[PDB]
Each structure stands twice: as C-alpha cells, then as structure tokens.
UniProtKB/Swiss-Prot annotation:
Component of the BCR(KEAP1) E3 ubiquitin ligase complex, at least composed of 2 molecules of CUL3, 2 molecules of KEAP1, and RBX1. Interacts with NFE2L2/NRF2; the interaction is direct. Forms a ternary complex with NFE2L2/NRF2 and PGAM5. Interacts with (phosphorylated) SQSTM1/p62; the interaction is direct and inactivates the BCR(KEAP1) complex by sequestering it in inclusion bodies, promoting its degradation. Interacts with NFE2L1. Interacts with BPTF and PTMA. Interacts with MAP1LC3B. Interacts indirectly with ENC1. Interacts with SESN1 and SESN2. Interacts with HSP90AA1 and HSP90AB1. The chain holds residues 325 to 613 of 624 of the full protein. This is Kelch-like ECH-associated protein 1. The modification S-cGMP-cysteine is found at residue 110. The gene is Keap1. Non-enzymatic covalent modifications of reactive cysteines by electrophile metabolites inactivate the BCR(KEAP1) complex. Accumulation of fumarate promotes the formation of cysteine S-succination (S-(2-succinyl)cysteine), leading to inactivate the BCR(KEAP1) complex and promote NFE2L2/NRF2 nuclear accumulation and activation. Nitric oxide-dependent 8-Nitro-cGMP formation promotes cysteine guanylation (S-cGMP-cysteine), leading to NFE2L2/NRF2 nuclear accumulation and activation. Changing residue 278 to A: Impaired interaction with SQSTM1/p62. It is found in: Cytoplasm; Nucleus. The record marks 110 as: Sensor for electrophilic agents. Disruption phenotype: Early postnatal lethality caused by abnormal cornification. Mice survive until weaning and probably die from malnutrition resulting from hyperkeratosis in the esophagus and forestomach that cause gastric obstruction. Defects are caused by constitutive activation Nfe2l2/Nrf2, leading to constitutive expression of phase 2 detoxifying enzymes. Mice lacking both Nfe2l2/Nrf2 and Keap1 reverse the hyperkeratosis phenotype and are healthy and viable in normal conditions. Changing residue 91 to M: Impaired interaction with NFE2L2/NRF2. Changing residue 10 to A: Impaired interaction with SQSTM1/p62. Transmembrane segments: none annotated. It comes from the Eukaryota. The Kelch repeats mediate interaction with NFE2L2/NRF2, BPTF and PGAM5. KEAP1 contains reactive cysteine residues that act as sensors for endogenously produced and exogenously encountered small molecules, which react with sulfhydryl groups and modify the cysteine sensors, leading to impair ability of the BCR(KEAP1) complex to ubiquitinate target proteins. It comes from Mus musculus (Mouse).
Amino acid sequence: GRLIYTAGGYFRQSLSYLEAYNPSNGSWLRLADLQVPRSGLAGCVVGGLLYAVGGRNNSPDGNTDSSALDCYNPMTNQWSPCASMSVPRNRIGVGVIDGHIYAVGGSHGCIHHSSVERYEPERDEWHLVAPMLTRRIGVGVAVLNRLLYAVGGFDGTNRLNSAECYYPERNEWRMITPMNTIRSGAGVCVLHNCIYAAGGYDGQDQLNSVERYDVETETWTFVAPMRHHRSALGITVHQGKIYVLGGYDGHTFLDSVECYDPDSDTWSEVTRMTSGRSGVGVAVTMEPC
Ligand SMILES: CN(C)C(=O)c1cccc(-c2cccc(-n3ncc(C(=O)O)c3C(F)(F)F)n2)c1
Ligand SMILES: [Cl-]
C-alpha cells in the first residue's frame, strides 16, 4: 500500500506537520514532525525515501529561507538531514530523474533564482547544472520521458505562462509552447504522456482551471476545472489519478483534497486534510511498516 504524504505548509505561520493519507481506506496518520517548520517547500521520493526540499520558515521569531534537504524513512518514522543546497530556495519546484533530485528556481529574499542544482543520494552531494532561461519562483516541475519541465511561476516582476524543458545529456534548457493561462504557484505533475498544470495565481485571481501539455503534439488543452480555485496547492499522482491538496482560494486556507479521473474528465472531493493549509510538499511512497 502507498500513501500520499503532505509535509509542511502554511497557516498563520509555517508548519512542521507530516501526515499521510491512505486512498484505500480514507485514513490520515500524523507522523514525525519536520525538524524545522517550512512552507513553500517541495516533496519527492527516491528509493522509497521521502525528501523535503527548500521552503521558508515564516515564524513570529523571524523569516528564514531554507536551503535544507531532509530525508524521511517510513521504516523508522525519522527525519535525517542531508547536504544543503548551494542557496536557499523558497517556493521551489523539484523533479526526480534517474535517482537524482533536481531543485529548480525559488526565492531567497528578493533574489528570484533561475539556477538549478542536482542532488545525488549515493554521494550526499549537490551540483549546479545549467540555469533556466527564466527566473522562476512558484515554479511547477514535472518529469516525463527523463526530461525535466519548468512551468510558469513568477520572475520577480510578472507571473508567467511560459514553460521550458531541460535535456540532461545536453545540459541545456529550451522553451516549449507556453500555457494558455498565466500560472504561478500552480500544481504541476505528469500523467500518461501529459504534463498537467492545475490552478495557480495569474496576477489577479486564484485559478480553478486545469490544462495539459502533450509532449507529442506540443500543445496545451484545458480539461475540466477543479471544484476549488487554488494557489499554492500540493499535487501528486497515486494509481493513475491526480490528487490536489490544500492551497489558498483568496478567502480560506483550504483543507479540500480533490482527485481527477482522466477517463471521465471529472474532479471529485476525496477527503479533507486534518487542517486547512497552503504551500505544502507532497509525494507518494510506502506505508510506515
Ligand atoms: C496567502 N499565502 C501567502 C499563501 O497561501 C502562501 C504561503 C506560503 C507559501 C505560498 C506559496 C507556495 C508555493 C508557491 C507560491 N507562490 N509563488 C509565487 C506565487 C505568486 O503569487 O506568483 C505564489 C502563490 F502565492 F500564488 F502561490 N506560494 C503561499
Ligand atoms: Cl513565503
């Protein structure tokens, strides 16, 4: 059995929560807290281990952007620090290729990063790679066919409809077709042969719209919209379905979890997080024992 893990997030301040939702039975487990509260982080899994990457501790006692990489082992229910990134990256995106973690973009104070770096678990080492063509914070990241895509975000001045693709064997970024919608702090994931971008902020409104990029056709197509408008949502795939978790709708820090069924093109309410929050990190791995 596999669980959807949600790490960190934001309500009033950055959160240390780690909780795991089991689609098979509707249940939530609270697991070991993050060592450091963080919002605007990303989650990913490599070799059954859950990693929490970047973010920011927004707290009454000060605000600190995170360069941290921390590893959670479901077998032990324990967090362990890994090597830190070259730079703090709040509102980061991440993707895994070939057992390596790419950390993309994000902010450090007023610095909006185009830089990108790659973590090798076997070596506990980060190394910089080619930077993106654009500065992107609140960037959506997905991996399809061992290529890494960076989608939308905020460049320090404008929210972006643009997207680009990183070709590892050439260490090179190239623009792809722009989305039909400006999206920053969207949820971005892969399903089948498509990159999905769900929600985000366009500069004026939180979005419910959802569109997908087909790598073979190089075009974006809208699918059915989510039931909730949301920016700073978490997103993941579990058994061929997209799940979106939390976010901010302009009014409420959402506890809503929705899932998308591509065959019926419908979104439905699935469960509620134990408390409303935005800016979480999400990934899927094995049950704790
Ligand atoms: C209302 N608040 C501030 C929160 O709910 C919140 C709190 C902490 C972290 C984030 C977050 C997480 C991931 C991406 C983003 N970005 N990154 C860029 C933009 C943009 O405006 O362009 C956004 C946002 F806020 F929409 F979603 N934010 C949002
Ligand atoms: Cl923030």
